[PDB]
Design a protein around this ligand. Sequence first.
Ligand SMILES: [Mg+2]
Length: 126
Amino acid sequence: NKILLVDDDRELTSLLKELLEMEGFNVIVAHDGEQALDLLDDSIDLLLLDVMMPKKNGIDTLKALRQTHQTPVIMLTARGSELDRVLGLELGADDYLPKPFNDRELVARIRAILRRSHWSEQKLAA
Ligand SMILES: [Mg+2]
């Protein structure tokens, strides 16, 4: 499974890339919304997307990517109010996990959405 990490915090993306690779995932990193849209293609199984970023924020990235891709999206951001969470989900995100986050919960939420993608793939092939 291929994950596209989108966050301007280079310290967080390096830490998360290492954590997720250790959990068996293939991770590619984007540091803004424009780079994310450049790297988003059919090979991506899931996006981890931040909100507050320079050039193009996560909400605008989500709106743009949803015009062409149905790729699973988990918002992963310091914008964790109940409002922020509802907004993200309604704009097209599958899940919303505020920062600070628990490593194990992040990995389990990634695995839960990719398990649903696998169920859909099995059904589609049949
Ligand atoms: Mg942030």
